[PDB]
């Protein structure tokens, strides 16, 4: 056979390298200010998400990363279990 293709998958997201890093650091990473423009602060938010997306899975263009995430995010039950777990933690 030819070599099988490599893809983004929920296992990467649920890995310790994955989504927990964002929740462990996002409060410290991003910072808005009224003292800078909308365009300024708006640009700032995307920085962290871009660098994190590269570190996670360098295949593809940033937009493609988001739009790929939509499919697995809506379909996989284990990922959804993790997400309802987050919002239960806030219900705790």
């Amino acid at each position: 056979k030819r070599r099988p293709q490599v893809k983004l998958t929920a296992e990467k997201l649920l890995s310790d390298k994955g989504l927990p890093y964002v929740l462990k650091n996002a409060h410290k990473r991003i910072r808005i200010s009224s003292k800078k423009n909308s365009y300024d602060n708006l640009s700032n938010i995307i920085q962290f998400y871009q660098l994190w997306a590269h570190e996670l899975f360098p295949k593809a263009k940033f937009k493609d990363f988001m739009k790929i995430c939509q499919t697995v995010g809506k379909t996989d039950p284990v990922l959804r279990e993790y997400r309802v777990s987050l919002f239960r933690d806030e219900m705790g």
Partner: protein, 665 residues
């Protein structure tokens, strides 16, 4: 066989000379043509070659033969023009029947050869083979017919009509009424022939104007000039306006719909109203060009393309990247963008309409067609007199036909009716917006109950069977009716009509419609948006409302709005005003903030708001920056109150009962 084929071609060629010829005694250098004999039989047998053979075998070979021997250009036009000019001189003074017989039968061939072309999966392989070439030859026909003596054959065709206008309807035999259908059937073709559409067999993934044809020969501009000099517009105007008085409506009023479609098609109404001028706007446009040049310059290095050094960028966790070029040294935004731009893949992509001639339904209409001044004023005069004279009487007849015949319809007649309605109603609204001499009463037949039912029924039936082109046109017609209603309410029965228009069944349909738009072409989504804006604005001025607005707000509508909004480089200044009006409605008024916290919206506002996209001084930036400020304020508040939304922002919202309620609020 090939020899049988060429035998028929030769038979035709001999018939192409038995017909007659000019006179070489004449010493008149040249004279006109001169007439043969058996020629009745010649014309009749040619008619048989079309009907009894080519139609029965479904070929178009016979047409190829007559095009080879140039019959139209060479004999038919001078036979007719000589008949016309002879009878004209006789009328100036103020067997002959046989001459008139020849005039009739030449015209009927002109209709046949210039008849427009249709291709399907049931057309013969012969026709499919010959489609592209006969298109070229019909283009030649259009140019020629408009050119001869500055178009004088068109006076022959209407003189034929004038014989049958002449004497009382009470006398007029069925054979007699066919002449009055035939003449109008001619002008439809002459307007309808236009440059070809390229078509190929999809076996492998890898212009059609002939050398004697050019655009100015073929443009709609030309056709206006040609008809005006040759006295057509008076005929269409007189004939349509006295239509109610006992001309048998049945024979005329569909052909006479198709004309009005076939040259309203490809005009934007604003081009007919102005709202050194050309030079002034050209200079202003050059300023815009300079701004684009400035944008390129701001991304251009001072020193040359091989001077460039190398750059390294270190992340958190001490890992490093490499990028080249001299601007990357100073601009991190550019370095970040340039870094991702190298990467190869793009996800491959998905794609609604076929079978009908180019129109608003499947072309970008931000592209005018162009008028001489005399043409501009003559065209404005023709349709203005049409509206003030003919429109109500025409619509009343054609609509009370179609209610009795809806089941039998074909896709084209549906798309004609819905794009004749739309054009004339909009143009009148614009004309009276401009000036007080105009009035809205002229188009007022559209509102009465029967037509409202019929536009509704077309939209209904088209939607259920998933016919998306009729659904698209019906969307355009139903938009205008609503627009006209809000006009008239800004001045009795109209409220009754509203209440019936906004029964619950229809709200289910009109709410449903933007949701499916996400898949389809850029026009479809634009129709959905403009209809939605109108639909909500009427019900705002009804004063029910809270039921209806909550019906609209959900994920699959928002998806369509963003998917449309990100192609803003192609769209108008006005449409973006409409989209942000809706976001103001979702975000501030309804206070359903949770819909828009989704990441591909946040990307969009950077692109569009950057020095990249929307101009620093267009009115759009007022709205956009005033929106984003408020957006990010509310987002700040939400994120600090509940940190889980950092992982929320990537994904759709979560539809579980126990956690989802707190999630959304």
């Amino acid at each position: 066989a090939d020899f049988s084929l060429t035998v028929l071609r030769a038979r035709i060629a001999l018939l192409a000379t038995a017909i007659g010829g000019p006179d070489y005694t004449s010493q008149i250098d040249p004279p006109p043509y001169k007439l043969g004999d058996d020629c009745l039989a010649c014309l009749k047998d040619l008619k048989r070659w079309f009907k009894l053979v080519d139609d029965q075998q479904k070929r178009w070979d016979v047409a190829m033969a007559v095009a080879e021997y140039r019959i139209l250009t060479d004999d038919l036009l001078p036979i007719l023009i000589d008949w016309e000019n002879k009878c004209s001189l006789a009328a100036k003074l103020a067997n002959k029947a046989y001459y008139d017989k020849i005039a009739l039968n030449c015209l009927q061939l002109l209709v046949l050869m210039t008849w427009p072309l249709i291709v399907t999966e049931q057309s013969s392989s012969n026709q499919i083979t010959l489609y592209g070439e006969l298109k070229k030859h019909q283009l030649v026909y259009k140019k020629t017919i408009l050119s001869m003596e500055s178009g004088k054959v068109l006076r022959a065709a209407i003189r034929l009509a004038l014989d049958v206008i002449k004497i009382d309807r009470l006398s007029r035999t069925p054979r007699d009424n066919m002449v009055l259908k035939l003449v109008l059937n001619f002008f439809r073709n002459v307007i309808a022939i236009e440059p070809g559409e390229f078509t190929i067999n999809t076996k492998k993934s890898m212009d059609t104007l002939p050398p004697n044809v050019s655009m100015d020969d073929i443009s709609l501009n030309t056709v206006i000039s040609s008809f005006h000099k040759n006295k057509v517009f008076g005929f269409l105007l007189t004939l349509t306006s006295s239509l109610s008085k006992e001309f048998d409506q049945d024979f005329i009023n569909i052909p006479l719909l198709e004309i009005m479609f076939y040259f309203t098609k490809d005009v934007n109404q604003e081009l007919l109203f102005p709202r050194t001028s050309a030079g002034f706007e050209l200079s202003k446009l050059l300023q815009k060009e300079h701004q684009m040049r400035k944008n390129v310059i701001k991304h251009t290095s001072a020193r040359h393309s091989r001077f460039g050094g190398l750059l390294s960028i270190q992340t958190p966790d001490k890992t490093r990247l490499t990028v080249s070029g001299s601007q990357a040294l100073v601009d991190e935004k550019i370095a970040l963008q340039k870094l991702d731009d190298s990467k190869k893949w793009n996800k491959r992509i998905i794609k609604a309409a076929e079978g009908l001639p180019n129109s608003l339904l499947n072309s970008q209409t931000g592209k005018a067609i162009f008028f001489t001044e005399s043409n501009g004023k003559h065209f404005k005069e023709f349709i203005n007199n049409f509206i003030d004279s003919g429109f109500n009487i025409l619509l009343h007849s054609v609509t009370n036909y179609f209610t009795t015949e809806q089941d039998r319809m074909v896709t084209l007649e549906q798309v004609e009716y819905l794009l004749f309605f739309a054009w004339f109603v909009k143009y009148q609204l614009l004309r009276s917006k401009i000036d007080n001499s105009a009035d809205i009463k002229q188009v007022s037949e559209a509102l009465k109950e029967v037509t409202f039912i019929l536009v509704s029924s077309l939209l209904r039936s088209a939607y259920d069977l998933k016919n998306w082109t009729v659904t698209h046109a019906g969307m355009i017609a139903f938009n205008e009716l609503l627009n006209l209603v809000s006009r008239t309410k800004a001045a009795t029965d109209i409220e009754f009509i509203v209440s019936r228009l906004f029964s619950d069944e229809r709200i289910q349909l009109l709410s449903n419609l933007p949701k499916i738009g996400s898949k389809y072409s850029l026009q479809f989504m634009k129709s959905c948006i403009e209809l939605t804006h109108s639909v909500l604005k009427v019900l705002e001025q009804y004063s029910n409302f809270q039921k209806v607005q909550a019906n609209y707000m959900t994920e699959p509508v928002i998806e369509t709005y963003i998917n449309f909004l990100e192609r803003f480089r192609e769209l108008e200044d006005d449409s973006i005003k409409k989209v942000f009006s809706f976001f103001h409605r979702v975000f501030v008024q309804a206070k359903e903030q949770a819909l828009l916290f989704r990441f591909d919206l946040i990307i969009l506002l950077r692109e569009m708001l950057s020095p990249d996209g929307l101009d620093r001084m267009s009115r759009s930036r007022k709205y956009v920056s005033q929106f984003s400020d408020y957006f990010l304020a509310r987002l700040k508040k939400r994120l600090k109150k509940s940190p889980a939304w950092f992982v929320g922002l990537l994904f759709p919202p979560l539809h579980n009962s126990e956690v989802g309620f707190y999630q959304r609020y």
